[PDB]
Amino acid sequence: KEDTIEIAGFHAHVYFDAASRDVAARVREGLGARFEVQLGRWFDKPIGPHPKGMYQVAFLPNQFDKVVPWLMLNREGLDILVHPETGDAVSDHAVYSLWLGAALALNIEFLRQLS
Amino acid sequence: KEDTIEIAGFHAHVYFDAASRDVAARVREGLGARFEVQLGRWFDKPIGPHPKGMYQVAFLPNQFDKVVPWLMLNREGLDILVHPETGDAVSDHAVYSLWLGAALALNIEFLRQLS
Ligand SMILES: [Zn+2]
Numbered sequence A, B: 001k002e003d004t005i006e007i008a009g010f011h012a013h014v015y016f017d018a019a020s021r022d023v024a025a026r027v028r029e030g031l032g033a034r035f036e037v038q039l040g041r042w043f044d045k046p047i048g049p050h051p052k053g054m055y056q057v058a059f060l061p062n063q064f065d066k067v068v069p070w071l072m073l074n075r076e077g078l079d080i081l082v083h084p085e086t087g088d089a090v091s092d093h094a095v096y097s098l099w100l101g102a103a104l105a106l107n108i109e110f111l112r113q114l115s
C-alpha cells in the first residue's frame, strides 16, 4: 500500500459547457464563500488534459471532507474530477482520481508528453 | 444550497468479479486494519441496486478523508461507489455519489420501489 501522507493536496476540476456555465459559476461562488480553496482561472476552452471548459479548485488535505461532500450535494449536475497531488501527474489524473457526475475522457497523453 | 450536515455517514461499495476477488479481499483487509469502518457481507452475485458482486463498507463522516483518499491510492483497479447517507436512498446513490474507477450502472428503480 502507499501512504496517504503522500497526498499534498487535491484539485477539483469543475467542467462545464455553454448550457451549464451559469450553474458552474454558482458552484464556484459556493466554494469560494465556504471553504479554504484557491480558485484557478476560468478556461472556456479545453486545455492540457482537460476535455472541456473548466476551472480548478485547489485545497489542502484538511478540506477534502469539507469540499468534496459539499460538491457531492451541490454540484447541480456538473461533472467534476477530483485528484490528489502526489508528484505523479499521470497517475494523479488517471488512476488516483475520482469523479462526481459522469466521467469524461481526459487527454492523459498531454500529461505523459510533459514527463 | 444542500447542507452537508445532512450527511450522517458514508458507504463504499467495492465491486469485484472472480478475477478480481482476491484484490477485493486485500483492499477489504486494508480497510478493516486501518479505519473506523463497519464491514458488511460479501455478495459474490449482484443484489438489489448492484450490477456486480460487491461488499459494503460503512463509516461516519469523520473517516471520509481517511477512507476515501486511501482507496484513491490503493483500490488496485477496482471500481468503487461511495455514497452518503442522508435519508434519501435514491438521491444518495444516483445524484450524491462519486465513483473511483469506472462507474457501473446501478438499478435506481430498485431503490424507488423501496417506496
Ligand atoms: Zn488539477
Ligand SMILES: [Zn+2]
Pocket: B011, B012, B013, B056, B083
Ligand atoms: Zn450503500
